[PDB]
Design a protein around this ligand. Structure first.
Ligand SMILES: OCCOCCOCCOCCOCCOCCOCCOCCOCCOCCOCCOCCOCCO
Length: 636
């Protein structure tokens, strides 16, 4: 568990980085799968967050792995880690040609069939509306095909690394999905299913008719990205390239740079309305050309096609969260020669996008300084009319919690750190004064909310509450006097503390570079966060840092009803019956063999929250990269 670090006082941030790096990479510690070398969500298996099992992982984890290795190359001159990390990503979570059969049959003039989204999972399956609803046209596909051929070079968002659900073979890493039934489907409320749907498992039509209603069903494959992962990966590779070339070792990462540029080009798919409807339509009004482009990183792009028959489809997404933007990666794709898109229009599109993203952050900045949630081009996920008085951004409606409501997607303070960290890197590398007010207001805000205790502990915001709306955007920040944040709780989340330290140190470095005076308070706060995270949460088992958390939410293992339509029946691969009346655990009965099951169940029987220790991959990496940023800009 967490203990006071034995580390000698005054240990350099470089030395801290290299110690923590070593512990992350040590095979005995178990952060990576023995067979593929894929980073798990966490060492521990019983954990329920975005993934619902700890050895399920996400494209996020793959991106953090690349970032870790880039910093290692910076500090040691050894670039093999970057090569290895990108290879693991490309080999596993980026679907290859055999895994995207028939994508060459995609028709950009008939991209997909329309379906409503709904406010509760019990409304699903959602009817596919063939020939009742016309959709718009995809203006980027052919430009990408001309450069790269038929397939998407993006990461699917979720992978069952040791085939725990059984949808794949042996213990092989397997593409899966969970979330599918709208904004109120929490992680506790999903029915896990295979991305490659061969009807082997589930019901007669596999899992398909839990989610979509149609006259017939065909075997099919489907992937969905999370563009913050790709963005982070590319961001990392910008730094790998910069640092490697400083060392005269740019050739070691040149191939990875080319792949990152390509991935960046494919992220243009995330810039479009779900069904290529006109931005601002407030109706199901199909667009052509770029009239469906919001030029933000929306929550996903998804694509799919047939197995055993040749057909394909693609959707964007109408919802954008500030937390998923990355104007740094955008600027890299737009402006950096080595990352120049191979397609004819990628550079232009990215130039438009990174600037639009920067406006988005400004529009969303509350009176206090925290960044509010985002916007949608599809009110209620059904292209409904905006309510009276709705504030807008280029025709998109403000929403405080884009995409998901259980919990509200902008309650989590962590998005402030993850996303504004990218804005700091953008300011550092450009000195663009257009974002100075944004970043200074956010820094002064966040630093007013960090608590440093005389006993050497710390607290940072954990949960946020929002009221009001920004003013409608006309190109200039108004101060948004009626958009308000309140911090409702604080905590010691190690990864957020690291990300925040990263943001503050990067900002400090930028102030030194551009402003003629270093913000030493920002520098020092970054140092304090790293120091206090490391010192108070050092893992006694030598695995890095570790949390100790009461998980009151884990009563949902046993209490959460999972919606199944009346009359539907099927089985999970292990034989668990999927039918009305199931709870979370009932379709995941292998959890009863987890080494921490008894602790969680016995706590439940006592009416108590169980207390668990976790080593999340992204926690370890966000802290390590923060140590590295300090080492880079503030050595000694
Ligand atoms: O010719 C016949 C063809 O007909 C066939 C029809 O084919 C169908 C095609 O269209 C189908 C329409 O389907 C709609 C698809 O939309 C659903 C998308 O669902 C997948 C979305 O995946 C995204 C998952 O999102 C959840 C991830 O959120 C994580 C939040 O991040 C926060 C992480 O921070 C950790 C916090 O830690 C807290 C610890 O205290």
């Amino acid at each position: 568990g967490p203990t006071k670090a034995p580390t000698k006082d005054g240990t350099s941030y470089k030395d801290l980085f290299l110690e923590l790096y070593g512990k992350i990479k040590d095979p005995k510690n178990g952060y990576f799968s023995p067979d593929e070398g894929i980073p798990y969500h966490s060492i521990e298996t019983l954990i329920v967050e975005a993934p619902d099992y700890g050895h399920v992982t996400t494209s996020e984890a793959f991106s953090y792995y690349v970032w870790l290795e880039a910093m290692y190359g910076n500090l040691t001159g050894n670039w093999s880690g970057v090569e290895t990390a990108w290879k693991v990503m490309e080999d596993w979570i980026i679907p290859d040609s055999t895994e995207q059969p028939g994508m060459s049959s995609y028709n950009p003039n008939s991209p997909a069939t329309y379906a409503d989204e709904y406010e509760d999972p019990s409304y699903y399956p959602s009817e596919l509306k063939f020939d009742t609803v016309r959709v718009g046209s995809d203006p980027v596909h052919n430009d990408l095909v001309s450069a790269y051929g038929p397939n998407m070079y993006l990461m699917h968002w979720l992978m069952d690394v040791d085939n725990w659900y059984g949808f794949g073979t042996g213990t092989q890493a397997t593409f899966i999905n969970t979330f599918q039934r709208g904004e109120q489907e929490s992680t506790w409320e999903t029915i896990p299913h295979p991305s490659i749907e061969e009807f082997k498992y589930g019901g007669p039509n596999g899992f398909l008719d839990l989610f979509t209603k149609d006259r017939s069903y065909a075997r099919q494959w489907r992937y969905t990205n999370a563009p913050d992962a790709e963005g982070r990966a590319i961001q990392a590779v910008y730094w790998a390239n910069k640092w490697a070339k400083e060392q005269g070792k740019g050739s070691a990462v040149a191939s990875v740079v080319s792949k990152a540029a390509k991935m960046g080009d494919f992220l243009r798919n995330d810039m479009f309305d779900k069904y290529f409807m006109k931005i601002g339509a407030q109706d199901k009004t199909p667009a052509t050309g770029y009239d469906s482009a919001h030029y933000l990183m929306a929550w996903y792009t998804s694509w799919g096609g047939g197995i055993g028959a040749s057909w394909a489809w693609k959707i964007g997404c109408s919802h954008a969260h500030f937390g998923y933007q990355n104007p740094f990666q955008g600027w890299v794709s737009a402006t950096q020669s080595d990352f120049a898109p191979k397609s004819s229009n990628g550079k232009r599109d990215w130039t438009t996008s990174y600037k639009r993203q920067l406006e988005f952050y400004q529009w969303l900045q509350s009176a206090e300084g925290a960044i509010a949630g985002g916007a949608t081009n599809s009110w209620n996920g059904r292209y409904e009319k905006y309510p009276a008085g709705t504030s807008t951004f280029y025709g998109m409606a403000y929403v405080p919690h884009p995409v998901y409501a259980d919990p509200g997607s902008n309650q989590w303070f962590g998005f402030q750190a993850w996303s504004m960290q990218r804005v700091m890197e953008y300011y550092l590398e450009t000195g663009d004064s257009s974002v100075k007010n944004l970043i200074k207001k956010w820094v002064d805000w966040v630093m007013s909310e960090i608590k440093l205790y005389d006993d050497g502990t710390f607290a940072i915001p954990s949960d946020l509450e929002w009221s009001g709306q920004p003013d409608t955007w006309t190109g200039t920040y108004t101060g948004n006097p009626n958009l308000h944040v309140r911090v409702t709780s604080y905590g010691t989340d190690l990864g957020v503390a690291g990300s925040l330290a990263n943001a503050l140190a990067t900002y400090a470095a930028a102030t030194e570079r551009w402003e003629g005076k270093l913000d030493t308070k920002a520098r020092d706060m970054a140092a304090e966060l790293v120091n206090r995270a490391w010192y108070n949460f050092y893992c006694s088992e030598g695995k890095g840092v570790v949390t100790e958390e009461a998980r009151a939410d884990y009563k949902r293992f046993f209490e959460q009803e999972v919606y199944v339509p009346a009359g539907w029946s099927g089985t999970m691969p292990n034989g668990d019956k999927i039918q009305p009346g199931i709870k979370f655990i009932d379709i995941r009965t292998k959890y009863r063999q987890d080494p921490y099951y008894d602790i969680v169940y016995q706590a439940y029987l006592r009416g108590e929250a169980p207390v668990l220790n976790y080593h999340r991959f992204w926690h370890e990496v966000d802290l390590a990269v923060a140590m590295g940023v300090l080492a880079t800009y503030f050595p000694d």
